[PDB]
Structure formats: C-alpha cells, structure tokens
C-alpha cells in the first residue's frame, strides 16, 4: 500500500520550498491561487504574492493536513488553487556531505563535498548572510544561468540547496584547481600544444556562452579550472548576465571591476558584451603563454586604464607563437566591433594547434 501524501512530513512535500528567497518566490508564483509553503528567516509562511504566517496549525496536527483542508474545502485563508512544486535542481542538505574550504569569492566560501548517494565529488558555493541585501538577492544568479547549460568546457550545475540556510549552489568538482595556479606550478613542464588545447577549451566554452546570449564579465585564468586530464572549464558565473540583444548595461551602484582584464568601454561606460569578454579572452591568452605572469605588473589599475587609452597593450610573451600573439592583438582592438568573435577565435586556435 501507499502512504498518503498528506500524511508525509512537511520536509518531504513537493511545495515546501524552505529557505527560498523572496525574488524567487515571486517568480514561481504566477497564476491566481498558486501557492507554496516556506520558512521565515520557527514561523512557516503560506505564500499565495500574499504572505500568510502559519499543538495544531492554522491561519490540524501538521501543516500538510492544513494545506489539504484548505485546498479540499476552498475555505478562505484569498483561496488556494494550485500547489507549486520545487524544480528538479533542488537538493536537500542531507544529500550533501560538506568538506574543506577550497576558495572564496564575493559571496563567501566555496567548499569541496561529496554526494552521499554515490560519492560524487562536488564544489559547494555558499552565501555569507551578513552581506548587503542587494548582493544576497543575486546569489542564485549563477544557478539560474547554469541550470540552462551543458558543455564540456563549462562547469556543470548539480543542484541547489535552498531548503534551509545556509543556501548552497552545488557544482561539479574540477579537481586540478584554478588555471592561474596550474600555470604557475606546472608551467615549466607544459608543452605549447597543451597550452593551445587548454585555451582552445576556453574558446569553445566562450563560443557556447555567446550562443546562449551569456556575457561572463570576469573571464580570467583564476576563474578557469583544470581537470586531472588537463581539460579546462570556465567557472565563477557570479557576475554573468543573459541579454537577448547582446549588451548588458551596468545598473546603478558600485561594481567590482577586475580592471586589468576589463575592456575600456566596460571599464569606463559599463557596456558589457561578448565583445568585452573577447578582450578578457586576449588577457587570458597572455596569462597562458607567459605561464601565469601578472599583467601590466608595474602599473596600478588607474595607470593601466590610462596606458590602454593611449594605445598601450601587453607585450608578446617570449616564445609565444606569432599567430597566437596576433590573435591577442585582435582581441584588444579598442572598438568592440573590430574584435573577432569567439567562433573565429576558436577556429583560429584549432588551426594553430593542428599545425603544431
């Protein structure tokens, strides 16, 4: 026989969304009488986008019994109509075994972990609760973006733990760590063919992102990851934006700008595009063929801005193939329209590699 749904603990209900933030609630609640139950940051809340605060329960000995009573009787709390399910990416906290810290970003710590069910190693991005509300409201962007994608050179989303605090975004673990560190530790033994393959991987990922109308905005060696087989994957989509018509205009307040990787029109006018990511790609090429040198090492960020405005660019690294440097130079055209596309860049890199 079957256990009735209403006899199940709240924790198990498809329409219990736990620690789902407000922004997400409003998105999920679409039609009249759509509803879900969630927890207040011991109060539970029946959201229908009206928010009704819930040993009995009312507005029954359990909350599922209350919802069923309401739904089945159409009694006014507003009348409930349709319970709204968690989407397929939601993962319970108990499905994840958290491990040690592996990095930090502007939202807080990143940890390794394992899925309890099959031991899959994962990366777990966390959000510090003490951050400003406008920032915390952006935390789930990386999940919203990555839910849509599947590519060998893009970090895979595994799940989202929004049933309780602290909220996590769970992704594949790319076990060789960041590409900048990789270049600085392994660089002396790396062949040029390998470097070409790895920036080829990056170009493949970026071509994919352009095809999805995604603008990354923080492309750099530090934000790419390397597998144990030297495959490169693009990560840290915290700054990324999706724009159907190709341009993201910076909104409003202060921004964190990685100045030495950022195109002039992005840095000074907040015009971001696949073209501005192409500039960043050129910097990534320079990082790679210099085996992890810091760009413009003798200039502060303000100085680099002025240097670049005057037509200054990074020098050719020693032993960088000439076709690779020419491509860099094209990536750093002042006018965004004069830069090559990621499709063009990937083709060129594949051509250069095949001739090596």
């Amino acid at each position: 026989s079957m256990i009735p749904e209403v006899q199940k603990p709240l924790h198990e209900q498809l329409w219990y969304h736990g620690a789902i933030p407000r922004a997400e609630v409003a998105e999920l609640l679409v039609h009249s009488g759509d509803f879900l139950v969630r927890e207040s940051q011991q109060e539970y809340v029946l959201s229908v986008p009206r928010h009704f605060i819930i040993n009995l329960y009312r507005l029954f000995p359990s909350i599922p019994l209350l919802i069923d009573h309401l739904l089945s009787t159409q009694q006014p709390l507003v009348v409930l109509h349709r319970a709204v399910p968690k989407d397929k990416w939601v993962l319970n906290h108990e499905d994840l075994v958290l491990g040690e810290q592996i990095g930090r970003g502007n939202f807080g710590e990143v940890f390794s972990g394992r899925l309890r069910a099959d031991n899959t190693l994962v990366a777990v991005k966390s959000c510090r609760e003490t951050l400003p509300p406008d920032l915390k409201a952006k935390f789930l962007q990386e999940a919203r973006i990555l839910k849509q994608y599947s590519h060998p050179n893009i970090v895979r989303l595994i799940g989202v733990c929004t049933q309780k605090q602290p909220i996590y975004i769970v992704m594949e673990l790319v076990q060789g760590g960041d590409f900048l560190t990789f270049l600085r530790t392994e660089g002396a033994r790396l062949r040029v063919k390998t470097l070409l393959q790895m920036v080829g991987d990056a170009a493949a990922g970026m071509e994919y992102l352009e095809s999805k109308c995604c603008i990354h905005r923080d492309l750099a060696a530090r934000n790419c990851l390397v597998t144990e087989k030297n495959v490169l994957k693009i990560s840290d989509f915290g700054m990324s934006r999706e724009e159907a018509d190709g341009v993201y205009a910076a909104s409003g307040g202060l921004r964190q700008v990685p100045v030495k990787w950022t195109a002039p029109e992005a840095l000074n006018y907040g015009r971001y595009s696949s073209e501005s990511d192409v500039w960043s790609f050129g910097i990534l090429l320079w990082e790679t063929f210099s085996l992890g040198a810091s760009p413009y090492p003798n200039l502060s960020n303000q100085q680099t801005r002025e240097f670049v405005e005057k037509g200054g660019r990074l020098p050719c690294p020693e032993l960088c193939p000439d076709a690779v440097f020419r491509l860099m130079e094209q990536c750093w055209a002042y006018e965004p329209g004069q830069r090559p596309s990621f499709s063009t860049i990937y083709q060129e890199l594949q051509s250069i590699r095949k001739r090596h």
């Binding site: 202060l254 921004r255 964190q256 700008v257 100045v259 960020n301």
Partner: peptide, 5 residues
C-alpha cells in the same frame, strides 16, 4: 585585482 568603482 578588483576595484570597487
């Protein structure tokens, strides 16, 4: 690397 601007 990052500047708030």
């Amino acid at each position: 690397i990052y500047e708030s601007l």
